[PDB]
Structure formats: C-alpha cells, structure tokens
UniProtKB/Swiss-Prot annotation:
Subunit structure comment from the entry: Component of the PAN1 actin cytoskeleton-regulatory complex. Interacts with ABP1, KRE6, LAS17, LSB5, RSP5, RVS167, VPS1 and YSC84.
Gene: SLA1
Official protein name in the record: Actin cytoskeleton-regulatory complex protein SLA1
Subcellular location per the Swiss-Prot or TrEMBL entry: Nucleus; Cell membrane; Endosome membrane; Cytoplasm, Cytoskeleton, Actin patch
Function comment: Component of the PAN1 actin cytoskeleton-regulatory complex required for the internalization of endosomes during actin-coupled endocytosis. The complex links the site of endocytosis to the cell membrane-associated actin cytoskeleton. Mediates uptake of external molecules and vacuolar degradation of plasma membrane proteins. Plays a role in the proper organization of the cell membrane-associated actin cytoskeleton and promotes its destabilization.
Length: 64
C-alpha cells in the first residue's frame, strides 16, 4: 500500500550541488521516497539521519 517502505543501497558517492540534492556515500542505506517524478533522479531518505533529497537514479540499487 501507500505506506510500503522501499529500500535501496547507494552504489556510488554523490556530492550535492543544489539544496534539493542529497549527499551520499557508497554503501549507505536509503528509503526510496519517489522514483517516479523525475527520469534521472530519485528522492531518497538516509536511514541513518532521515536527511532526504534527490540522488542520481542509477546510483541506487533497490533492495528488499
């Protein structure tokens, strides 16, 4: 349902340039909040901190 949690693992480091982006390190665990609105960017939430923002789509491995 609409509260289903969708997990991912970060595969590459990424340093945000804009405020809407999320700095991430390879191996970081995330929740995938929105993989539909943008073609090349997903809105993710870090499991350690709750900090959220856009990350390159191809950097996130969806996992269970």
């Amino acid at each position: 349902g609409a509260m289903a949690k969708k997990r991912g693992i970060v595969q590459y480091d990424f340093m945000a340039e804009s405020q809407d982006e999320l700095t991430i390190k390879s191996g970081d665990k995330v929740y995938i909040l929105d993989d539909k609105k943008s073609k090349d960017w997903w809105m993710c939430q870090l499991v350690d901190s709750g900090k959220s923002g856009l990350v390159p789509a191809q950097f996130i491995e969806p996992v269970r």
